[PDB]
Amino acid sequence: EIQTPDQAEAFVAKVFDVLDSYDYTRFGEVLSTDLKYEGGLQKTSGLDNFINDIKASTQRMPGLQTSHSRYRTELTAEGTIYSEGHSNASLESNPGKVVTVPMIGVFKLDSEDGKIKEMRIYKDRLPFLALHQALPGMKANN
Amino acid sequence: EIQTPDQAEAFVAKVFDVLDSYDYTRFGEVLSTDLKYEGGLQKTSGLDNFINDIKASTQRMPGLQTSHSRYRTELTAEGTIYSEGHSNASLESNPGKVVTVPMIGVFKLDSEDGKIKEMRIYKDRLPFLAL
Ligand SMILES: CC(C)C1=C[C@H]2C[C@]3(C=O)[C@@H]4CC[C@@H](C)[C@H]4C[C@@]2(C)[C@]13C(=O)O
């Protein structure tokens, strides 16, 4: 059970380690099957609907690779985790180009099994339009 | 001064009412002179630099009209305000076309005067390309 900001931050890091793998068979390890997700105008109910929202993104961005870091997390008396950090993304065909923006995640956990029941992620997606398909092994950025 | 989350939420609403006026002569009513602001890739230190960055960012959006609403606010033991809500924008030339996105603001206050000394606003700006 998460009781300190550091434990909450470590759990957020574990969550994004799963999400950033795109191994959908592992998402239920950390996300409730009744997950309520919001990321901007993207809004889903249920883990399968969440996964189908992400798969569609990996098609807008072939070879998408992502990572997250954290620097400031609070765990509140209401049980909410607020975790501020950064979101990094590239396309595998040109890994020397990385887009990084600040982000914050708001999380609520299931009281029984500790999985994420509500996840609201806020960041600016406009800079990610700078990601672009390239030929792997062929220079694509000045 | 602020002691409850409902009071924190009312203050954030008042702050956005000032910001959404674009009347920079009033920004110091609620923002500290040494404001540290981040909004995605926008990042400023000092109230003068915040004003100048908003002024510059909006110069290519003549007729911009914005408003904000609040949904869910917490006030933590250490005084952080986390306020989730929505940001609405339209242009005076076409006021019926409104773009609304979720947002959250993270705020820390100056203990001496209760003004905002740190303000970090998170939201997706991509939908605003439609304006
Ligand atoms: C449309 C968008 C680019 C914007 C115009 C104005 C209004 C805005 C919208 O919420 C913000 C609300 C608070 C203040 C930082 C505003 C600055 C903008 C540049 C803002 C932003 O930085 O998001």
Residue nearest atom 18 of ligand 1, based on CA coordinates: B54
Cα A9 to the center of its chain, rounded Å: 14
C-alpha to C-alpha distance for A40 and A107, rounded to whole angstroms: 15
Sign of CA dihedral B3, B86, B119, A66: positive
Give A46's DSSP letter: S
What's the structural domain count of chain B? 1
Q: Which residues, other chains included, contact A107 with Cβ-Cβ below 8 Å and sequence gap of 6+?
A: A12, A15, A80, A81, A82, A83, A116, A118, A119
- Method used to obtain the model: X-ray
The residue range of the domain holding A14 is: 5-130
Residue nearest atom 17 of ligand 1, based on CA coordinates: B54
Residue of B58, A126, B106 whose CA lies nearest to B50: B58
C-alpha to C-alpha distance for B52 and B58, rounded to whole angstroms: 10
C-alpha to C-alpha distance for A80 and B74, rounded to whole angstroms: 9
| Chain A positions with Cβ closer than 8 Å to B | 38-41, 74, 76-78, 80, 82, 84, 101-104, 106, 120, 122-127, 129
Distance from the CA of A114 to the center of ligand 1, in angstroms? 36
In DSSP notation, B4-37 reads: SHHHHHHHHHHHHHHHTTT-GGGGGGTEEEEEEE
Amino acid at A46: G
C-alpha to C-alpha distance for A47 and A93, rounded to whole angstroms: 29
Q: Count CB neighbours of B39 within 10 A.
A: 21
Q: Which two tokens stand for residue B52?
A: 């100048």
In DSSP notation, A13-40 reads: HHHHHHHTTT-GGGGGGTEEEEEEEEET
* Closest ligand 1 atom, residue B128 Cα: 1
Cα-Cα end-to-end distance for chain B: 38
DSSP SS3 for A66: strand
In DSSP notation, B44-70 reads: EESHHHHHHHHHHHHTTSTTEEEEEEE
Give B119's DSSP letter: E
* Closest ligand 1 atom, residue B42 Cα: 22
Q: Compute, in degrees rounded to 10, the torsion defined by CA atoms A114, A119, A123, A129.
A: 110
Residue of B87, B85, B89, B98 whose CA lies nearest to B65: B89
Distance from the CA of B116 to the center of ligand 1, in angstroms? 17
Q: What is the CATH number of the domain that holds A86?
A: 3.10.450.50
Reported structure resolution in angstroms: 1.3
To which H or E segment does residue A12 belong? helix A5-19
Tell me whether residue A142 is in a domain.
no
Residue nearest atom 5 of ligand 1, based on CA coordinates: B58
Mutate to test the interface with A, among B124, B125, B128 (most CBs of A within 10 A): B124
Cα B110 to the center of its chain, rounded Å: 16
Rg (C-alpha) for chain B, rounded Å, is 14
Q: Which residues, other chains included, contact A101 with Cβ-Cβ below 8 Å and sequence gap of 6+?
A: A86, A87, A123, A124, A125, A127, A128, B40, B41
Say if residues A124 and B41 touch (Cβ distance below 8 Å).
Answer: yes
